[PDB]
A paper describes a structure:
A reconstitution of the [name] 30S–[name] complex was performed by mixing recombinant [name] and mature 30S subunits, obtained by dissociation of the purified 70S ribosomes. The final reconstruction was performed to an overall resolution of 2.9 Å. Comparing the map of the 30S–[name] complex with individual 30S subunit maps (EMD-23052, EMD-3624) revealed an extra density, which was assigned to [name]. This density is located near the CDR between the head, neck, and central platform of the 30S. Therefore, [name] causes the head to shift relative to the subunit body by displacing the neck. The 30S head moves up and back approximately 10–15 Å from the interface side. The 3′-end of 16S rRNA (in the mRNA exit channel) interacts with the hkh motif and the α1/β1 part of [name], and the β1/β2 loop is directed toward the cavity between the 30S neck (h28) and the h44-h45 linker. α3/β3 is inserted between two bends of rRNA (G1517 and G1541) and the outer side of α1 approaches the central platform (h23, h24) and S11. The RNA binding side of [name] (hkh and α1/β1) holds the 3′-end of 16S rRNA (G1542-A1548) where A1543–C1545 interact with the AXG sequence motif (Ala70-Lys71-Gly72 in [name] [name]) of the KH-domain. The amino acid residues Ser97-Asp115 of [name] bound to 30S form a helix-like structure, which interacts with the S7 protein.
Numbering used by the authors:
A (entry chain k): 10 to 127
B (entry chain o): 2 to 89
C (entry chain f): 1 to 94
D (entry chain r): 22 to 79
E (entry chain A): 1 to 116
The structure:
RNA sequence: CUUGAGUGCAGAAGAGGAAAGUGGAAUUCCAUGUGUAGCGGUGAAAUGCGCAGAGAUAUGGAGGAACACCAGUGGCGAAGGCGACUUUCUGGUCUGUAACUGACGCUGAUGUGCGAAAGCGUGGGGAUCAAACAGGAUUAGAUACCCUGGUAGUCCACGCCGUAAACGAUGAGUGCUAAGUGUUAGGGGGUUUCCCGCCCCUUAGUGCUGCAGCUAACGCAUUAAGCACUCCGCCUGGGGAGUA
């Protein structure tokens, strides 16, 4: 049933770097069925970082998400992304039932030294 | 580093009169005890330079007190120097 | 003469008999070298704030002992390391 | 006037903790620097026993 | 009034600025999950920061009245981070393009309505 | 003789030091589940990886490094420096009392130690980062800034090296000379039933503002760059030259 998994409660994994945005939709335990990225849909370079690219990637990810059926979903925020602040309204306007919003910023407890230069 | 009880017994048995707590003999004795303790620690822990600096300060204090004793009264210095077996 | 409060966590998977054997053996090996237990208490089932390795919970219990400076840690630092039935422990002072 | 903070009394260690499980700064709680040092020592010791979380949001 | 160098300074200043504003500005009770975009003059003495906030027209004002106080900390840390010689003065302004662009999408309805 | 110095007695705080053990986050990598055509990068690109299943997500594992919050114009140390927790060993400082020794003190050439980072030798380890090096980008040109990798090194043990804008650019010791206001560790008194509050007095640090005074000015000002005494180190125009 992997392809046509019928579940209305998963988790929404967005990822928005300062150059690109990757959006994927998984199950509650975290089983990916579909994803969308600015690089997949003709966005190159700067236009990938622009927020509306992230919003449209979220729309095209949600389309495939409810293709197999999905109603409620929780959003996880990874990294600093210029498209994340409107992403929640994008998914909720796409016909979703977003329940919990959680920002997961991986902050190292001084494990490895950051790159010196940019 | 010498436990308070050992300190008290050292000043008990190196005292000069029953009320005396600080005097060249008592101070030199307790300093020798502390010096031996820190020397044992440095024997076990070699690369401990701050403790060695403290030990050098203790050695200097003991040597200055010993010089003061030898200048002040020679006989008690002569009997003290062999009680602990130092200053060959 | 220093009091060494020590608490340790045993996994919930153990049987009751094995749990009691563990507790009595650990108190005995703690106090057998010269330490004398002043208070051995079984705090009991209490929810952890994190999964240790894969266990959700454990048994808190406290042993308070006074001895010299190397009667509490000496056997723990070996036996608790090899013994996988223990998963967490530490010893504090006064 | 508690004058001694013990890491097994989790009520006081939850009264002075954040919703993230982080230690609240002295300005927020308004305690003293000495008791602040005792509190962070106790909180770290409790965290070592899985008695308090490292990062909690759920 | 713009050079590639100003663009690189803007990008690398945006990356650090977003980090500091959301990971080090504790004291202002009104912290907000913000997005940002920064532009500068050719001489790097003036820099404009454009950002978005979530809330009402009293929460954006509270957050602004908090950013106004925090500007000192931001400038200090930013100078402590980047190699740039002269700290540009910083003023924070809403990215009106967000609402204007949204209004820009609005008349799309009118074109589709009359042709249907 | 007790005032300086020191030992006591009762207390206090501390990332002071050395050794062993323990823990969480994060990191890279490996394995597994889902899953398809992209990932990361920049100003834009490009180099590179990706159909052999990448990136993303979830779980498990391996190893190394450093300890997010606390965190402070805070603390400790002679300096360099020292922040996860526990234990062991150990140095220094401060407060109050002060019966105890009774000037036992200060400075300190030669001497002997410690001494950031880099670097050298023998080994071990190596996750991130990254001189050199390879490629791409940029440029009139770019050997550089930017990107993709990456060796020595960064880490550990024992030695060597002994230098820094090693800085308070202010040597150490002592005494005197207006104030105001924070802050760390104590002590005492008063008020309040009670200090958990507050106020007053005080010792030792650590800040800011300011008299007299000093300075060429900037500025310093009880943490003096003021008023004095003791001892040590050093200077006598710039370049040549830290050269022969």
């Amino acid at each position: 049933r992997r392809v046509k998994k019928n579940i209305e409660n998963g988790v929404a994994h967005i990822r928005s770097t300062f150059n690109n945005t990757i959006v994927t939709i998984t199950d509650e335990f975290g089983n990916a069925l579909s994803w969308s990225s600015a690089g997949a849909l003709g966005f190159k370079g700067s236009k990938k970082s622009t927020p509306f690219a992230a919003q449209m990637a979220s729309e095209t990810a949600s389309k495939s998400a409810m293709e197999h059926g999905l109603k409620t979903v929780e959003v996880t925020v990874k990294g600093p992304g210029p498209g994340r602040e409107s992403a929640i309204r994008a998914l909720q306007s796409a016909g979703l039932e977003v329940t919990a919003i959680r920002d997961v910023t991986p902050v190292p407890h001084n494990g490895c030294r950051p790159p010196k230069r940019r | 580093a010498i436990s308070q009880e050992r300190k008290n017994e050292i000043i008990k048995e190196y005292r000069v009169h029953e009320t005396d707590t600080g005097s060249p003999e008592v101070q030199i004795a307790v300093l020798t005890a502390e010096i031996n303790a820190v020397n044992e620690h440095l024997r076990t822990h070699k690369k401990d330079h701050h403790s060695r600096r403290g030990l050098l300060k203790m050695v200097g204090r003991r040597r200055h007190l010993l010089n003061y004793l030898r200048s002040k009264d020679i006989q008690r210095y002569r009997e003290l120097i062999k009680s602990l077996g130092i200053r060959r | 003469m220093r009091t060494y409060e020590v608490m340790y966590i045993v996994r919930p998977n153990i049987e009751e008999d094995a749990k009691k054997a563990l507790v009595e053996r650990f108190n005995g090996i703690l106090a057998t070298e010269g330490a004398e237990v002043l208070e051995a208490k079984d705090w009991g089932k209490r929810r952890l704030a994190y999964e240790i390795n894969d266990f959700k919970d454990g048994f808190y219990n406290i042993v308070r002992v006074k001895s010299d400076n190397n009667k509490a840690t000496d056997e723990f630092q070996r036996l608790a390391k090899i013994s996988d039935d223990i998963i967490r422990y530490m010893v504090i002072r006064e | 006037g508690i004058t001694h903070i013990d890491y097994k009394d989790t009520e006081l260690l939850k009264r002075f903790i954040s919703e993230r499980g982080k230690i609240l700064p002295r300005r927020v709680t308004g305690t003293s620097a000495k008791y602040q040092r005792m509190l962070t020592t106790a909180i770290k010791r409790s965290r070592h026993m899985a008695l308090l979380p490292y990062v909690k949001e759920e | 009034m713009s050079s590639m160098r100003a663009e690189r300074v803007g990008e690398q200043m945006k990356k650090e600025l977003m980090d500091i504003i959301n990971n080090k500005v504790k004291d202002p009770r009104v912290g907000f999950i913000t997005i940002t975009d920064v532009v500068l003059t050719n001489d790097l003495s003036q820099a404009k920061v454009f950002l978005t906030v979530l809330g009402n027209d009293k929460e954006v004002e509270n957050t602004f009245k908090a950013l106004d106080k925090a500007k000192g900390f931001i400038k200090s840390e930013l100078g402590s981070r980047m190699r740039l010689r002269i700290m540009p003065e910083l003023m924070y302004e809403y990215d009106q393009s967000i609402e204007y662009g949204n209004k820009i999408e609005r008349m799309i309805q009118d074109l589709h309505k009359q042709d249907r």
